[PDB]
């Protein structure tokens, strides 16, 4: 049996908030094509190491086989990076806070071909969380859901942990004073945003593993192995 199911809602929140990865910094130094590629690649490469240790602290994730853990991370790693970027940028409308020393807007995504489209989608998601007044306890639930859900069809244990996180989200909204109607409405609103986050990841991954973008930059071996997973 898994320990994650015996936890309570506040215990689930507490464990998720405590497992949060740190906010990393970018290199210190106008951006061109390769410089922005090197800056974002170096940042995401260092975040992945904190993400893997964060994943092991998501309740129920450790109970998976080592293969299942590898597969979920390979499927959802860019989704997890985006919802973190979107979360960090909530307080900065029109700007993407990649790092505390790296705020970018639309025009900075223009020096990389095709990246403006996804910047716009990321800015729209961040503004959407802002207008929803997304709380941190809701954020850590959504990000863990992304980790467990995105690779669940490519078994029964994951779905009862997903049920557990759903109870937690509703427990947070009821604790916030939302009515029964506002509870399941807000629940649906947050989960439909995950479909868009999946869409941004697919469109963004499509550029990453393109042979052109693959040869512009020294992508790390780890970032290549995470990229080859989407063969």
């Amino acid at each position: 049996n898994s320990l994650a199911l015996s936890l309570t809602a506040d215990q689930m929140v507490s464990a998720l908030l405590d497992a949060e990865p740190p906010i990393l910094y970018s290199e210190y130094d106008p951006f061109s094509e390769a410089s922005m590629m090197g800056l974002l690649t170096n940042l995401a490469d260092r975040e992945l190491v904190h993400m893997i240790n964060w994943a092991k602290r998501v309740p129920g994730f450790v109970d998976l086989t080592l293969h299942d853990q590898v597969h979920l991370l390979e499927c959802a790693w860019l989704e997890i990076l985006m919802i973190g970027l979107v979360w960090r940028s909530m307080e900065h409308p029109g700007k993407l806070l990649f790092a505390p020393n790296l705020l970018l807007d639309r025009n900075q995504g223009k020096c990389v071909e095709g990246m403006v489209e996804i910047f716009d989608m990321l800015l729209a998601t961040s503004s959407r969380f802002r207008m929803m007044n997304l709380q941190g306890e809701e954020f850590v639930c959504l990000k863990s859901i992304i980790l467990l859900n995105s690779g669940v069809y490519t078994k029964d244990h994951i779905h009862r942990v997903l049920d557990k996180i759903t109870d937690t989200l509703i427990h947070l909204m009821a604790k916030a004073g939302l009515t029964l109607q506002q509870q399941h409405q807000r629940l649906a609103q947050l989960l439909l945003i995950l479909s868009h986050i999946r869409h941004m990841s697919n469109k963004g991954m499509e550029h990453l593993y393109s042979m052109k973008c693959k040869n512009v930059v020294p992508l790390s071996d780890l970032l290549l192995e995470m990229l080859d997973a989407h063969r």
Binding site: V49, L66, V70, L73, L222, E225, M226
Partner: peptide, 10 residues
């Protein structure tokens, strides 16, 4: 034969 295996075990 995969970096992800090692980081998940350490």
């Amino acid at each position: 034969h995969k970096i992800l295996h090692r980081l998940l075990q350490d």
